[PDB]
Amino acid sequence: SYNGIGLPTPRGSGTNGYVMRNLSHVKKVQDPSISEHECRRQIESKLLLYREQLLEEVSSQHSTDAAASDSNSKTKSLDEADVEILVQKYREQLLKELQLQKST
Amino acid sequence: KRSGATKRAQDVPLIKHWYLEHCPPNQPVKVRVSYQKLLKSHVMNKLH
Amino acid sequence: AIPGGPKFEPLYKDEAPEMEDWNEFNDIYKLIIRHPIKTEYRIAFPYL
RNA sequence: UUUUUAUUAAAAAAUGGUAUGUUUUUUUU
Incomplete structure (x- = not known):
């Protein structure tokens, strides 16, 4: 009749019901560092893309200078030599990785 | 209201709300049982 | 049974282990x- | 981890214990 305690009706038993509370109830790192290595390679690639953006901005500056010389469209500063200066960047970053591995 | 229909004298209970509400605390056992039994009779009256 | 309210008869005595x-x-x-x-x-x- | 509350009922008759069945007329001629 209440919280699962009691009998449905006191009729039929010699008792009045009246359930009571018990009153005595006891109520008690990363193993594959190649992850970091690949993250570093990816961030180096994104730095390369950042330098490509810088190259495009320099190309816009070159286009403005060419238009000014004509006064006295869109052009590209360097088609492939920027890849060689990027190769220098690869050499420098490889040297940096070698030095860091030497330090560790 | 200010306007009604003059029920009969015996149709006014005058204390029905006393036991329709909860029982006041610290009352003896027999009083609590009386409250509960009167409420039971009222519930049976309303059900049918 | 709400512990302040009335107690009635079961009204539904079909709870035997007929399903077993x-x-x-x-x-x-x-x-x-x-x-x-x-x-x-x-x-x-x-x-x- | 602190606190509780839950209260069936209910008396009278007949069985049952001073059976029962009986029981007083105005005409004859």
Whole structure:
């Protein structure tokens, strides 16, 4: 009749019901560092893309200078030599990785 | 209201709300049982 | 029975083990116990 | 981890214990 305690009706038993509370109830790192290595390679690639953006901005500056010389469209500063200066960047970053591995 | 229909004298209970509400605390056992039994009779009256 | 209110007869005496099966549905094995389901819950939301 | 609350009833008759069945007329001629 209440919280699962009691009998449905006191009729039929010699008792009045009246359930009571018990009153005595006891109520008690990363193993594959190649992850970091690949993250570093990816961030180096994104730095390369950042330098490509810088190259495009320099190309816009070159286009403005060419238009000014004509006064006295869109052009590209360097088609492939920027890849060689990027190769220098690869050499420098490889040297940096070698030095860091030497330090560790 | 200010306007009604003059029920009969015996149709006014005058204390029905006393036991329709909860029982006041610290009352003896027999009083609590009386409250509960009167409420039971009222519930049976309303059900049918 | 709400502990301040009336107590009546069962009105439904059909609860024998005619199924003879616990139905593997209400078993403790597959049930998350968080709080006991009081009868106030069974009265406030009778259909759930 | 602190607190509780829950209170069936209920008396009278006949069985049952001073059976029962009986029981007083106005005409004859």
